[PDB]
Each structure stands twice: as C-alpha cells, then as structure tokens.
Motif scaffolding. Sequence first.
Motif, mmCIF file in Angstrom:
data_model
loop_
_atom_site.group_PDB
_atom_site.id
_atom_site.type_symbol
_atom_site.label_atom_id
_atom_site.label_comp_id
_atom_site.label_asym_id
_atom_site.label_seq_id
_atom_site.Cartn_x
_atom_site.Cartn_y
_atom_site.Cartn_z
ATOM 1 N N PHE A 8 0.850 -1.177 0.000
ATOM 2 C CA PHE A 8 0.000 0.000 0.000
ATOM 3 C C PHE A 8 0.892 1.235 0.000
ATOM 4 C CE2 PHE A 8 -3.306 -2.727 2.262
ATOM 5 C CZ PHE A 8 -4.316 -2.565 1.328
ATOM 6 N N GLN A 9 0.400 2.338 -0.586
ATOM 7 C CA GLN A 9 0.980 3.661 -0.392
ATOM 8 C C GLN A 9 0.696 4.096 1.047
ATOM 9 O OE1 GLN A 9 -0.730 4.996 -4.665
ATOM 10 N NE2 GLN A 9 0.366 6.607 -3.598
ATOM 11 N N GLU A 11 -0.612 6.591 2.520
ATOM 12 C CA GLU A 11 -1.910 7.102 2.914
ATOM 13 C C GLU A 11 -2.774 6.001 3.543
ATOM 14 O OE1 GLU A 11 -0.169 9.645 -0.280
ATOM 15 O OE2 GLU A 11 -0.229 7.523 0.232
ATOM 16 N N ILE A 12 -2.492 4.711 3.286
ATOM 17 C CA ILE A 12 -3.461 3.726 3.735
ATOM 18 C C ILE A 12 -3.491 3.618 5.256
ATOM 19 C CG2 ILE A 12 -4.265 1.334 3.689
ATOM 20 C CD1 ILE A 12 -4.963 2.973 1.139
ATOM 21 N N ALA A 98 -5.542 5.577 -2.070
ATOM 22 C CA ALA A 98 -4.539 6.468 -1.507
ATOM 23 C C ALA A 98 -4.841 7.909 -1.928
ATOM 24 C CB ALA A 98 -3.155 5.997 -1.909
ATOM 25 N N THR A 101 -8.118 8.897 -0.007
ATOM 26 C CA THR A 101 -7.829 9.143 1.389
ATOM 27 C C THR A 101 -7.481 10.621 1.597
ATOM 28 O OG1 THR A 101 -7.207 6.977 1.809
ATOM 29 C CG2 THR A 101 -6.243 8.540 3.290
#
Length: 212
Positions: A8-9, A11-12, A98, A101
């Motif tokens: 994941f990036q 932001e997750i 992401a 978010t």
Amino acid sequence: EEVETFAFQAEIAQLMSLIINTFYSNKEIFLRELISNSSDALDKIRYESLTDPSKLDSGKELHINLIPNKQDRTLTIVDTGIGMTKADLINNLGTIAASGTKAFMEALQAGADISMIGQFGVGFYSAYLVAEKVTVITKHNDDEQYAWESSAGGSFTVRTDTGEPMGRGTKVILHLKEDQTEYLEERRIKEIVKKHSQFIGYPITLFVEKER
Ligand SMILES: CCNC(=O)c1nnn(-c2cc(C(C)C)c(O)cc2O)c1-c1ccc(CNCC2CCCCC2)cc1
C-alpha cells in the motif's frame, strides 16, 4: 507461487486510523458502503448492456446477495456488477484508495460530513471496522477471475482465482473479528439494510442459514 504482493501507499495507514476516528462508534456503516459499491458496478453493467446486450451473456440478473455464515465467522456480499480486471482491482483498492484518502481528509478538514466517505472512493476500507481480513473475488467480461486479499497492514495480494467461478461480478468476503459476530445475525443485517440502503435500485437478498 502465482501470488503477487503489493505494498500500500503510505496514505493507507492514515486511512485506517481516520476510519476508526470517524466511524468506530457506528461500525454498521460498512454494509452501506459495500452495498453502495455493488450498486455502482451494477449501474455500470446495466449501462453498457444497453449498447451491447451480449454484455449480459455472463449473467442477466443484476442483484446483490448477503451471505452470513456463523460457522465460518464470515459475511459475504455478492453482486453481479460489471466486475474488475486485475488493473481495476489494483487501481481501486490501491491507487485510488490512496488518492481518495487525501481528498476525503481535505474535505473533512473543511467540514464535509463523514457520511461522504463513499464518494471519495475509500468506502470499502470501512470493512476493516468489522473484519480482520477481507477477500475480494471479482470477474469482469474481458478478463479472468481474480482474488484480492488483505488484513489492511502494509500489503495486499493478487492471484488468479481458481475457486468457484462466478460468472460476472464481485464477491467480498469479510472474516469478521471475534467481537463483531453481530453482523452474522439475520435481524441485525435486515436493520442495517433497512436503515442505510432502503433506496438501492437493485434487489438486495439476505440468505438465511437454517437451524441445523
Ligand atoms: C472497471 C469497472 N468495475 C467497477 O467499477 C467495479 N466492479 N466491481 N466493483 C465493486 C468493487 C467493490 C469494492 C471491493 C471496491 C465492491 O465492494 C463491490 C463491487 O461491485 C466495482 C467498483 C469499483 C469502484 C467503486 C467505487 N466507486 C466510488 C465512486 C466515487 C465517486 C462517485 C461515484 C462512485 C465501486 C465499485
């Protein structure tokens, strides 16, 4: 192998914390969001079936089914929406998670309602209020059946699904946390649906388990 792993990036992890800090008190919201996403994919298949009715060759019925399973502690949500290619799968649960978010955080920070979560493309992640692990099986007409899986830590996996073929659409299986088995109760599910998804334009059917 044939399992692919994805990071994941960043932001997750922010997402997951935001979700607790916004919906922990109202966890039932996850069902509204999943039904809502199902509705969206249903809309897309209906729409393209107007220009090309062969799109419905993989299944004509446009619906949503809800399958509790006390014995497995799973709640599964099935739709016959348009489904997702591998790239849609990775794009919607990864890239757009992401970027959405960030957009959602900016919108709340400027006083938008939390009930907006769905419109920022990250509604699905609310599933982690109730589930330690989620599996998304999906099948779109131009592509194979894929399974996506994650405990919402740093990674998610994608594999070609070799399970029971759906004909077209998306299946989300929620592996519920020990303390959230209320989401397997017929009465509870009916309420949540009644409350949040009353005006969904597609049949939502609850599959009851027997006594045995
Ligand atoms: C390339 C076309 N395929 C699809 O779009 C698709 N196919 N199946 N689903 C789908 C996805 C999910 C989540 C796992 C992401 C789901 O729970 C049920 C679905 O049918 C989807 C799907 C993909 C993304 C979304 C989220 N849409 C949010 C968007 C935000 C702005 C306003 C319009 C709606 C909802 C459903």
